[PDB]
Amino acid sequence: XXNXXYX
Amino acid sequence: XXNXXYX
Ligand SMILES: *[C@@H]1O[C@H](CO)[C@@H](O)[C@H](O)[C@H]1O
Ligand SMILES: *[C@@H]1O[C@H](CO)[C@@H](O)[C@H](O)[C@H]1O
Ligand SMILES: *[C@H]1C[C@](C)(N)C(O)(O)[C@H](C)O1
Ligand SMILES: *[C@H]1C[C@](C)(N)C(O)(O)[C@H](C)O1
């Protein structure tokens, strides 16, 4: 991954 | 806020 969120 | 990221 490497991005974040939260969805 | 309350959401995340990262931008
Ligand atoms: C999500 O990423 C942030 C940034 O590194 C960190 O501070 C949180 O503990 C992690 O859940
Ligand atoms: C989200 O990320 C910030 C930055 O590291 C941190 O301060 C919060 O505790 C984490 O939930
Ligand atoms: C991350 C934060 C958020 C977008 N407010 C959420 O609580 O809805 C999600 C489930 O986790
Ligand atoms: C959160 C993750 C990311 C989008 N890959 C970033 O490193 O570019 C940003 C600065 O922090």
**What one-character DSSP code corresponds to residue A3?**
S
User: What resolution, expressed in A, was reported for this entry?
Assistant: 0.9
The full length of chain B comes to 7
Q: Is the four-CA dihedral A4, A7, B4, B6 of positive or negative sign? A: positive
Q: Collapsing DSSP states into helix, strand and coil, what is residue A5?
A: strand
Query: Cα–Cα distances in Å, from A3 out to A7, B1, B2, B3?
Result: 11, 18, 16, 13
How far B1 CA sits from the closest chain A CA (Å)? Answer: 12
A4's CB contacts (< 8 A; 6+ apart) are B4, B5, B6
Could you tell me which chain B residue has the CA closest to the CA of A3?
B6
Closest CA to A1 of B2, B6, B3: B6
Q: How far is B2 from chain A (nearest CA, A)?
A: 9
